[PDB]
Amino acid sequence: AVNVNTNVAAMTAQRYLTGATNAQQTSMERLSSGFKINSAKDDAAGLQISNRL
Amino acid sequence: AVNVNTNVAAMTAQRYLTGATNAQQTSMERLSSGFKINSAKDDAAGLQISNRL
Helix, strand or coil: CCCCCCCHHHHHHHHHHHHHHHHHHHHHHHHHHCCCCCCCCCCHHHHHHHHHC | CCCCCCCHHHHHHHHHHHHHHHHHHHHHHHHHHCCCCCCCCCCHHHHHHHHHC
């Protein structure tokens, strides 16, 4: 049906809009810094070995 | 991979450039003095037998 209060299409498009935005923010941080690991969230194990190296 | 943070090719060229400079400095010192044993590092037992001769 056609309803005004609920817009499922708007919510879904917004969710995928933020998904793209976060991917763009992490990719832009990687480019400016030149490092693909910046915090433990990128790679926990990789961060530790990279700090030991 | 293409990265800016690490330049292993430049590191290798530096390593072989300092080796060439060290061997060039040793040869220059050898020519000016006219001795191939200007120190103990050049030849230990050669230094002692040459000193005793």
